[model samples]
Target: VINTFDGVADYLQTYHKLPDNYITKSEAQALGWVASKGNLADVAPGKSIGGDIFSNREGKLPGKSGRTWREADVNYTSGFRNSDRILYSSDWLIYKTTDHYQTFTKIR
Candidate 1:
């Protein structure tokens, strides 16, 4: 179930016990998945690149200070739900290159 801006914020905080700093703008781009508990730390460290378009997963762009114009990250896990199995999970995120992995400015 998708949520409104404030609803999403409240849900993530309550469900994951997320730090006040976890859901910044770099992180916000992928809020839909993160709110659901999809793991996202891997993306920040440059592990998976959505479609495998590039090899430099470290957010470094050519002729630049290791920055990618746009990036999307997702992380999730599987678990049990009310005696049933479900992909119930959460995520971390990093996007754009200006913040240098800082908290999201836009979302605030």
Candidate 2:
């Protein structure tokens, strides 16, 4: 069920963002949304779209949610360590990056 950014547009039109007339335009919007979310690598081609949901619910934090313990560890070690617990939509993409934002390796 893996899909390119373009494919995501079709799904997004109904559930996420507003629908676009052209496929390319929709993809562009999808790319922008993913970039804004800051995890493009995870959603890029050949990458895993599924992972842990990070959160500390017991603490009753203003911005927190249930987390996937395993995926959180991987994301942390993989350079997303600074991110805090937050609810993530199941439908999302990740952009590839190495050594922080110095370089955006890929568009997933």
Candidate 3:
């Protein structure tokens, strides 16, 4: 499922795409994902939240012209989904953040 932090990064680094397990936030919402309740699995079975645009509103991660960011869930196989997320750039750069956007570490 490529759910781990580094495993997903490695998959993206090698494939330049999020795995099939990923579902965009809006898509999840359409599927009945209430972020506060972590009901993704209930709405969309076998799917994890991902493929959504991450605007970097905090400007905490590195920035560049024409660079866009995407966010995905990590280690959220079951239970309440935490804030751990992997943000990847249009340039294919990867980053990890466990506390939402509070901090980020470049993964690749």
Q: Which stretches of candidate 1 lie over 4 Å from their true place?
A: 17-103, 106-108
TM-score for each of the candidates? 0.20, 0.19, 0.90
Let me know the TM-score candidate 2 reaches against the reference structure.
0.19
By summed lDDT, the worst window of 10 consecutive residues in model 2 runs over 70-79
lDDT, candidate 3, 26-90, per-residue tens: 77777778888867778777778888898887689888989998989998876578789999988
**Local accuracy by lDDT, each model:** 0.29, 0.31, 0.85
Ranking the candidates on TM-score from highest down gives 3, 1, 2
What does candidate 1 score in Cα RMSD to the true structure? Answer: 14.9
Worst 10 residues of 1 by lDDT: 80-89
Residue 81, candidate 1: Cα error in Å is 28
Candidate 1 on 5-92: residue-level lDDT in tens?
3333344436633322233333444533242443343333222212112234452433244432332222212221111101112331
Error of 2 at 36 (Å): 24
Q: Rank the candidates by lDDT, best first.
A: 3, 2, 1
- Please give the TM-score that candidate 1 achieves against the real structure: 0.20
Q: For candidate 3, what is the lDDT?
A: 0.85
